[PDB]
Amino acid sequence: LRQRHTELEREVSRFEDQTQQQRQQYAQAKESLTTLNRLIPQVTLLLDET
């Protein structure tokens, strides 16, 4: 059962790492979508680069 703990701790580390990286890149992408639809939700049509 101690060997099982070790592999379990390895697997926990893999999921914690994977979830940390995944949530960081995906949250940065989600935050990018929020910046786009908050700062420029077709507001570029009011600007129109005139």
């Binding site: 379990l8 926990v12 999921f15 949530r23 992408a29 989600k30 979508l33 786009l36 570029t44």
Partner: protein, 49 residues
């Protein structure tokens, strides 16, 4: 911030790409978190065993 120029002239399509990412965010974190949590309980069992 993301991309270097990356079609900023008309960026509407990218929001749709980011939506697929946002859906997959929830799936990927919900499953991952549940897996580690399942093993946290199993660890406690193994600990209790």
């Amino acid at each position: 911030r993301q991309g270097r120029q990356y079609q900023a002239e008309d960026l509407e399509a990218l929001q749709n790409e980011l939506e697929a990412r946002q859906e997959a965010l929830s799936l990927s974190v919900n499953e991952g978190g549940e897996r580690r949590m399942e093993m946290r309980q199993e660890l406690e069992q193994l600990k209790q065993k």
